Amino acid sequence: KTAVDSITQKKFLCDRTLWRIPFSSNFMSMGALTDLGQNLLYANSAHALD
């Protein structure tokens, strides 16, 4: 009954892992050679990555 006014601190810990961002058009593993790695945009042209 004598609880103080409180705020909630939320966080997460995700150890042992690597934050995967797959270079696919729907972020899914439909194969090791993705659909955007075979793309003529990304396989014939040279792009800058920033």
């Binding site: 075979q38 793309n39 003529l40 945009l41």
Partner: protein, 288 residues
């Protein structure tokens, strides 16, 4: 006329209106009101504008052609790449200073001969660009002096190949041959790719003219460029070089109709509704 060094000198030195010295007849047609369009446009001027044009007509003013004669010469030197466009004001004051130190009746006549001489020399260069032959025929015939005129086997294939070799440099004004050290080369266009090595190709084709995995890829690049300038009877049918020249003519004709097939399939794949990424990859894998 846009590339005429004296028409361009008239657009930079002569007035843009009708003075009574350069255009005496065209202003006397207007003073005397015998003009077709608006004859009475001269009566409707004030006396300051109307009497000052009558005085310049019945006794006209003399002028210096020297700044106009020199500027026709400078604008032809800047056009035939003899000077830079940044040096166009430097050499204009340098030439005006020389024809001021040495001014004579001989020199002003000699500038009048030289502004007709640079009208010709600008047009002679622009004809020689669109013909595109004089820099290449003297350097391809200089190449063929080095190559022997008598191969042991297949001389009939060899003398028609080198005659078709003269047909590329003649019937393509952008193509050129030159030398860079020992070897000679052939670019199919100015500042373009597909540069074959003539001294390496003719030391590769020598020994293959009558043979009936062994070709350097610049020799095959030469046999691709020489293919539309070679008839079916220019080389043999069973000879391995003649068998490829027919095979490269079919490859050009198939790539000319796969070009038109590409423009049809991708046009009706957008309107029918497909992925624009996959319409452009499934078409090439159907055509290649």
């Amino acid at each position: 006329d846009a590339t005429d060094p004296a028409v361009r000198a008239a657009l930079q030195s002569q007035p843009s209106g009708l003075n009574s010295t350069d255009d005496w007849r065209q202003v006397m047609d207007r003073i005397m009101s015998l003009t077709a369009r608006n004859p009475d446009a001269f009566r409707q001027q004030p006396q300051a504008n109307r009497l000052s044009a009558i005085l310049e007509a019945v006794v006209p003013a003399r002028a210096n052609p020297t700044h106009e004669k020199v500027l026709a010469i400078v604008n032809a030197l800047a056009e035939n790449r003899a000077i830079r466009p940044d040096e166009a004001g430097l050499v204009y004051d340098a030439l005006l200073q020389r024809v001021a130190r040495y001014n004579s009746g001989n020199v002003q006549t000699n500038l009048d001969r030289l502004v007709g001489d640079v009208r010709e020399a600008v047009a002679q260069r622009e004809r020689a660009q669109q013909q595109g032959n004089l820099g290449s025929m003297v350097a391809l015939n200089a190449f063929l002096s080095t190559q022997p005129a008598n191969v042991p086997r297949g001389q009939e294939d060899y003398t028609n190949f080198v005659s078709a070799l003269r047909l590329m440099v003649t019937e393509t004004p952008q193509s050129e041959v030159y030398q860079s050290g020992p070897d000679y080369f052939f670019q199919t266009s100015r500042q373009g790719l597909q540069t074959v090595n003539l001294s390496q190709a003719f030391k590769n084709l020598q020994g293959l003219w009558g043979v009936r995995s062994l070709l350097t890829p610049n020799s095959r690049l030469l046999l691709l460029l020489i293919a539309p300038f070679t008839d079916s009877g220019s080389v043999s049918r069973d000879t391995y070089l003649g068998h490829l020249l027919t095979l490269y003519r079919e490859a050009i004709g198939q790539a000319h109709v796969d070009e038109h097939t590409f423009q049809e399939i991708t046009s009706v794949s957008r309107a029918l509704g497909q992925e624009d990424t996959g319409s452009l990859e499934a078409t090439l894998n159907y055509l290649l």
